[model samples]
Target: KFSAKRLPSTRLGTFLENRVNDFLRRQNHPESGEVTVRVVHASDKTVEVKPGMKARFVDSGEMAESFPYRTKALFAFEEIDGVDLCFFGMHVQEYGSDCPPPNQRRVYISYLDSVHFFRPKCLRTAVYHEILIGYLEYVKKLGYTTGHIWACPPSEGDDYIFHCHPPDQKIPKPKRLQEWYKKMLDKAVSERIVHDYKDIFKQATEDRLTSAKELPYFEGDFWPNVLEESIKELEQKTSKDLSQKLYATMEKHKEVFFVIRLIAGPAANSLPPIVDPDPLIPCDLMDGRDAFLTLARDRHLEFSSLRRAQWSTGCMLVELHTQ
Candidate 1:
């Protein structure tokens, strides 16, 4: 929907919205509701508006009873003075033909504002998967009569539309979205393990001032950075997904349900403790925390102690790969 009147003081975008609104009204289609407009422009003067599609109306004080109506049209108004204005020409959307029915609003347009504008088609397919799952899950949970996912790209190279209509059940119910979660959870578990190790390893690397130098037996040599090196060796030999490990341990070893994973090592890609800079990570295999720690501990001075800490204390379940 677009603005009705464009004052001279109106922004260039507002002026375009007004002209577009006038064109839509001139068509006099039943779906075209009264025009309303709002402007959103970033500091770069990039403008956007979220067009609301109101359906199955509610009571209004101004009206005697509920309007008993729904938004008939959904439109995005945009134009760049230096670019093609024909793209801004009133995008005509018809029920089911030009656009999906209001509630099932999915479109695949590679507008200039998109991040990977260079790969619009790929982005469309990717977002289609992402958005369809959301729509399906919401409908199923809310008990809305719906179907699987469907998308049809519009002629203008976008408008990848979708709907709540379910597809044939024979299509093997898309694995319930848990697979995606399992993948994400695994990545998260990896990150968490790495981060925890980094924190503990940093603590183990610092100097202490306990006023122990004057103490008779105080050798004052402890909390070495090599502590993490040991821990890293233990992880390599032990666990994969700490989450699943913890879960299984809670079920099978109920007496030790509160067991935790203790991390001690340099950051995933850090070098051995005493080295000046340690060997530099290769350009390609350089900075993964997992890779760093595993390499550091693979041949470090304290590999044995690290293994003991992991096996008895952190007790990471090293047998599995998440998802």
Candidate 2:
């Protein structure tokens, strides 16, 4: 029965699901009663957010780039009334054999694919910042680790980088992206999500490279390759135009690839205060209201008894850490 519920793998997806529903209820948006989160596991061939409407990653790997270490996620927000809307997605790599051991790991957040997710303009609680707080909650609960972002904004303008503003209105330069990453990184530390950190892109000591104004790229043989593989995956999944522009950014704008390390912080942080539970419950009654209610009630009881489970265990910590 719990298997049928199909919850997300991380608290980020869980919070987004909660946030989307919250937005719907506030506006009384039609089709407010839909599942907005899709789970793409370590080996899922395709992610079906809704029945008969699903897709694979559009690549030869069929799912994840590497083994279980690298996970390709399709975190979606679907508008059941329309052609199934998508709002959020990300691909994180735990990375090479050398990484993620000895009580720490490095998550290469290759790209954050989203739509209308900027923090300032949002009318609801869950925006990009909330989702990321949820991710740090994820990293914290998983034990401990540092998070990394290449912060390479594609030139042709991917929806993930553009937020809600018009693309022409706001640009997607690497210099701008690095600045944004620094601000957000500072925000996380300010909120106590990070214990320690460092500067915007560090130069390799091997080369005495000269600095450029707005030095919009990095001289790395490291992070660029990480971006490249994921960009290749992105190419396979999206349209030709997007693919070409992404490659152009890849080739010329490599320096803008900024890196910020967020060493996991203490477990005292909490989600932005919640809206009290409202009149209408979120479930499509057409899908059988009786079944969903059963799962809602019956869930966590077995986990409460400490039965063996993987993803749901993460769910428990996310709720508990909401101080």
Candidate 3:
């Protein structure tokens, strides 16, 4: 039942779910197979749960949505691997939205925790094994025959700056744990063992271990909070409604919005393309403004700007002259 399928409130929940379903379908598996995924938590939004789904954010807010662009994902693995691997799906900053080249997708995992059927000596190593097996199987079905695991470095400035960590679990100091995990996964790859899968495990490889370049740690407020402060400062000086709207829109998408600056043509303008410096005191809405507002809502005003770019070489004609 559609109602039974729990959906997460955050936009990322929908995006990740759609990606999983798309991958599942391409692998020639039944649409309604054993592949079960759930949104563990989100920063803001009501999470509807199904018989097998619930929001981890509601259960434990800090534990779930602590990282930037972070979404704790839960997976139910019934075949071809260990119990299950649970971790946060991270968006790689340097190569986001366009990475791993074409025909592939790479997801970074962090703060890994696991659920298992039986007791194990080292829980950490067990979790790593489970994740490796799970990833290889999923990608192969989607026609991604190759897999690689490497030691990830420490959290960069931008990544560290945006994250809000729990006092107890503070910084993972990721590079250390990543190095440890990589060693275990690497040994497994070296052994060339065949478990539940046919030859899929053989496809996995380990890259040279390397740490990310660490930047000076800044001990200040998060960027979003800083943006609000700057916006207020501007509001005080300009006393304009445009800055107010800008703040509101930024706040609405703060969690998901990428870098604040846009480096593109006029269509990429974050503020209103056309600003009226001195209009009537109580500027009444006009047809043009109304249309502009509509386009702004969808952030598709760029297309309209592109149309404007195609204007005649001759000069702008007065509106009354057009008649």
Candidate 4:
């Protein structure tokens, strides 16, 4: 139900993940490779991206349990066919809330560290989604309990505080998070990830020693960033709770089975994905050989011809849009 600490969420989606490999194949991207998601310990100097780190290819899950737990972690992609140049990269903070049992570890997607501008629009987003899915899954194997991220549109203005680009959204930032967490719960019930809010309330019997993890509130108290806050804010605007049950059910519902929806295409709004193809994605999306092949296939005419950029200009918007 919790972690040693919690971190931010990113905007990513399953809609494209379902078709990314096929999309890459159409473009003649690589057929196989690996991503060694390197974890940078807190002692490291601020975790900046170094281009062409020459990281080796390995299955996302092959990293033994002993990998260092880090204040920041890097997600870099490589192709097997060439000299293994890095493609896309993300920086995440992996800390615990309090570090007790369950250790309640989490990976908060901080921002995109490395990005390529010339890759086909679809391919770039695809590799991002692939690495995102991989990071979440492999972290679980390494003993983290959950993932955390947030998406806030630039229009909201507060995004500058944390300096993370959520995604460009047509919808209000608050409502996007409201839907994400609400959908998480609805699916949690429907898919039986948890029995029900009622059961959660019933289980609330424990002495409540720990606080449920919350997402990074970029604007802090100046604005609401987590689901609980959105509920409270909307309640203030409309003067009612999302429903008495949820407000009541949460000690910190501590969402463990959700991820952000991503965007593709130049004109696409970054908040919501094409659609949530599956409410609770049972398929691990791209894993094993598929992850490698997908990354391998997404390539450029020459790795040297590419110009490097970060999402500061909003290249890969992984909107976990949480107000």
Candidate 5:
């Protein structure tokens, strides 16, 4: 579940409030409206938290004795128009065992209403790179099979390398982290998945290409920010091979089925809502209604027709043979 009142308590929340308010104050814009914070994902591994701080598991009530939990929060400013501001924060305890956290763990305004803001171009690009990396790592940890981002606008030059690619096309491997993160962040921001909570769920069920006939399938490497160094860093860490199986299944079945889990307030995390028609979601995919319903029951998320539609279309899901 997510909450606005809890923002002041977390490391990233404090950082966002400070930076955003300062910027708004200078422009004499009214302080940001009520913020809706969504915990995109939280992991049970302490990277930089101080020693002795208790890190509890979301699934289990038990606390980790040595490692603290790390969390990613997405902040959406309500009532703001034209410039819909969104912040992404990665927070870990400052003191912790084994893992040394980055000194600069401040929250980042991952997606701004516009790129024409007053910040220095270099600084903006740097922040965007970091935000992209954060998002890449976050999704990887969740073990998603495929990820999608909106295609780049035509006005953008080839210098903006985050365009959509067909799944069959071999993904390009960038030699540098800067190159990798920049392209990845650009794609993520372009897709609006980072801020549009509904879209996040919508991706699971609907095919964007089917609706926006002009927009090709919004498919890309799930961890596009991972570079050569990244592989080395993660060499010691365990990696999932489900990606191979996922594609095999998808190839075997021309149709796709989606699975997603979202928790809001006291809403049931596994129970899914009833299935209903919605323009945002693809109706054909809804044919696999049992798969989604089963997922809801297994995961315990409260089910709703809209939520089911969003999750099935928006979030990453495993595809299987329908026949």
Candidate 6:
């Protein structure tokens, strides 16, 4: 995690652009035409460089502005002539603790609504999502129940980022858990405890709290509108096919009860090294547990989940990829 405070004011934009090019070149990265570098704004003791879009570019249409990077990324880019070495200053702390160390730090991006999930979504609903997946992975490893959500805590955090972790042992049942979830949802929406996702998803889940009856919000459906807007923006920035996929995921899983599993990776890149390798099991299909754990480790990809499933199996998994 580079953190140089000083950036040359003179020829700043061009200097940053050159540095980005040099950095990519040094990495032996192939040109995708997708990668771009530009100085969005440099003024008033602030110098923002639009780094290459190796990650998702949230504001794809308006390339002139400081588009959201989505993940909390940090890396040593290059030894530039004019700019500070701390190229990617963004960092994800382990918890809501004091300043985080550079090496252990990560960049965590949530796929939840930015309007609502001002705080990381991994800390909330996605908490259980990662757990279920991780738990399954563990079972696939040892061939039996290995652990649960209650035994440990969700691991990522900061002003805007959060970590995904497997669940601990001995938690309550699904119905009881949903009740607990309602309380958290209540805290998020009514209190605006963190941000908009709190309020937005709260509105989406209003009917569930009122009568324990599953229904959409009585007051206008803001969540649906939010999702619609997000899908458009995400599609415009990504490919047409990617946009359609996002639309389908949000629409099909809007109720929080629907779960979608995704399989994405380079056809060539091998799966991440598992904590407990199962040569016999063969890590063929994309496992939800491994994916979240991988994201938690890499902290480069964007991850999120709509809501936990109402059934005993928990929720369906949703996966997406770019190659």
The TM-scores of all predictions, comma-separated, are 0.16, 0.45, 0.26, 0.35, 0.25, 0.20
Q: lDDT for each of the candidates? A: 0.22, 0.40, 0.28, 0.33, 0.29, 0.25
Please report, as a residue range, the 10-residue window in candidate 2 with the lowest summed lDDT.
Answer: 45-54
2 or 4: which has the higher lDDT? 2
Worst 10 residues of 6 by lDDT: 308-317
* Candidate 5 structure quality by residue, lDDT tens digits, 1-323: 12234222433334444544454455453433433332322333333212211221212433222323232323323223322222222222111122222111112111122111213322444344434344433432333222233222223221111112222323233234324434544554555433212222244234332211111111121221222223344344775822333233333332222211112233322333222111121223222223333544455432123233223222212221221
Ranking under lDDT, best-scoring first? 2, 4, 5, 3, 6, 1
User: What digit string (tens of lDDT, one per residue) describes model 3 on residues 1-323?
Assistant: 12113322333333344544454455544323322333333221111221111121224321211112212333332221322212222211111121222112222332232222211222324333544444443433332323322233335421221122223333346556545554544544554421222111121111111110010001121322433454455547844433344345435433221111112234222322222121121111111123223432343221112122112101111111232
lDDT of 6 at 75: 18
Ranking by TM-score: 2, 4, 3, 5, 6, 1
Give the higher-lDDT candidate: 1 or 4: 4
Estimate the overall C-alpha local distance difference test score of candidate 1. 0.22
lDDT of 5: 0.29
Clashes of each: 18, 6, 1, 25, 36, 24
Error of 3 at 82 (Å): 23
User: Which is the better candidate, 3 or 5, if ranked by TM-score?
Assistant: 3
Off by over 4 Å in 2: 1-12, 15-35, 43-68, 78-84, 95-104, 117-126, 156-171, 200-323
- In angstroms, the error of model 2 at 298 is 42
Clashing pairs in 2: 216-255, 216-256, 217-254, 217-255, 217-256, 218-255
Candidate 5 Cα RMSD (Å)? 20.3
Model 6: CA > 4 A from native: 1-168, 171-179, 192-242, 255-323
